[PDB]
Amino acid sequence: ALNQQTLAIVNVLPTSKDPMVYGFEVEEKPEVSYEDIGGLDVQIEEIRE
């Protein structure tokens, strides 16, 4: 961050380019959860390993 008033650094910020949902959003609980392991069960085991 540069304070615009005199154009020097006043603060270091964290990362990155510009994060939107450009690598973010955690949902894994309802509606699809781990109670939907009644597949296709063998295929889930390959993923699990």
């Binding site: 109670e35 939907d36 009644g38 597949g39 296709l40 069960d41 295929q43 390959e46 993923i47 390993e49």
Partner: protein
């Protein structure tokens, strides 16, 4: 770049039933539903297919004005889903001994 290369084929006899179990669980109690029997009609279906059978089984439920999903509803819904994609002809079987 992956290493674990997975073919995710169409669900088995047993596989298809696991999907029905989650659905039936949401569609309350039953008294004549057999999950195997469903598998034999629905032989060669997908996971999303089974969810839509379940959706229409529900619909079929309120035309008889029911508060639970019995076996007739499933029979009907399976039949509806499947209907557009029978008939599969096998009348070459009159030309084979």
């Amino acid at each position: 770049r992956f290493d674990r290369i997975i073919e995710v084929p169409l669900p088995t006899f047993e596989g298809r039933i696991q999907i029905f179990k989650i659905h039936t669980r949401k569609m309350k109690l039953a008294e004549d539903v057999d999950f195997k029997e469903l598998a034999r009609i629905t032989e060669g279906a997908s996971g999303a297919d089974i969810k839509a059978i379940c959706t229409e089984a529900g619909m079929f439920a309120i035309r008889e004005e029911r508060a639970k999903v019995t076996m007739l509803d499933f029979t009907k819904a399976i039949e509806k889903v499947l209907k557009k994609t029978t008939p599969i002809p096998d009348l070459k079987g009159v030309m084979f001994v």
